[PDB]
Design a protein around this ligand. Sequence first.
Ligand code: 13U
Ligand code: CA
Length: 223
Amino acid sequence: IVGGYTCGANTVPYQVSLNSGYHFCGGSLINSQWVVSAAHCYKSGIQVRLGEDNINVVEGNEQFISASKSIVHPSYNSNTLNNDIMLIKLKSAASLNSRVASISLPTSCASAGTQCLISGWGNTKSSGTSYPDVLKCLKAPILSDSSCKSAYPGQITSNMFCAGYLEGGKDSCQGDSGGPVVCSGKLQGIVSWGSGCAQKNKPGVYTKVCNYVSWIKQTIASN
Ligand SMILES: N=C(N)c1ccc(CNC(=O)[C@@H]2CCCN2C(=O)CNC2CCCCCCC2)cc1
Ligand SMILES: [Ca+2]
């Protein structure tokens, strides 16, 4: 997260870290056994870390649970990042508490101008790299369809939206991938892609979760 703020320990209790001997992506807890992340985060050997604040120190409240299933959308395209969504099943159910909590799926899509919360342990620099120990947060609005497509002509599908700030300085970034964009208590986006981080005229691009609610439900019920 570039230009954000320290969230505060466990203030984003649905935020998970995906770990393979290091943090490599975020995710969102949607029930005690399932996490939503990005398809481009797929790999073997995923450990889900719930209840985290400082990802480099055991502080208490962590739960570490291996992934037992990682389900990339069948129509994911790694070149266009269309359908950039993955479901992870946990080997055992998480224990839900004030610090480890699910986020609701949308019942309808969000509109332009809606303010959302974006969070993660990704890079905090727009030039160069710096990775934080504790979770970072950013408030950011959804942009209009016309401004999104203006920004990235011929690259925005109906399964994407743009959010953030065209003036530069405030964005998600590498390592935030797969993490949440939450609007009015609903998981509306997944951190997916962008041109650089926090660059002028190049906002963040997010997977449009409302288009996937039926697929998510249908996939969880059959697995
Ligand atoms: N909000 C941001 N600025 C931002 C940018 C990047 C990321 C992490 N995502 C990435 O690095 C992803 C993974 C594979 C290549 N990615 C890219 O972001 C690479 N760039 C292209 C841009 C235009 C073509 C359409 C399809 C997307 C890729 C996360 C957030
Ligand atoms: Ca920790």
